[PDB]
Amino acid sequence: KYLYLVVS
Amino acid sequence: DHFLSCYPWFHGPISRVRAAQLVQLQGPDAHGVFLVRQSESRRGEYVLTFNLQGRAKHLRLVLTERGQCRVQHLHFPSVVDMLRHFQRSPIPLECGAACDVRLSGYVVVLS
């Protein structure tokens, strides 16, 4: 539903 | 939410479906076009709705009382600075360089 950001 | 009203890309309390159709209207050529809106399911919060190869995505934005904009592990002084950052650097997704998406233009609010 809502977008998840990822860290390296 | 009243303080963001000066910006032409802020649409206020429009719905997720309306926002999705606004940024999808021009299709995959509108890759990167965005708007900002209040969240309708988690009231008090805001959403960055943008076009990713013709599909609409919704990124949550949390605003401190001072106006600072927190996006998960990212912090910015303002939503404007958040927008300018993503105009220059890709939104960090798992697919990395394979799904490079930077914010381009914006949908002007229907006022």
Numbering used by the authors:
A (entry chain C): 453 to 460
B (entry chain A): 328 to 438
Provide excerpts from the study.
Here we present two crystal structures of the LNK substrate recognition domain, the SH2 domain, bound to phosphorylated motifs from JAK2 and EPOR, and biochemically define the basis for target recognition.
The LNK SH2 domain accommodates the leucine of the EPOR pY454 peptide at the key +1 position in a subtly different manner to the glutamate of the JAK2 pY813 peptide. The aliphatic portions of both the +1 glutamate and leucine sit on a hydrophobic surface of LNK, however the glutamate sidechain bends so that the carboxylate faces away and forms a salt bridge with Lys 384. In concordance with their similar binding modes, the surface area buried by each peptide is similar (~580 Å). Although the +1 residues in the EPOR and JAK2 peptides differ, glutamate vs. leucine respectively, their binding can be accommodated by the same hydrophobic residues in the +1 pocket.
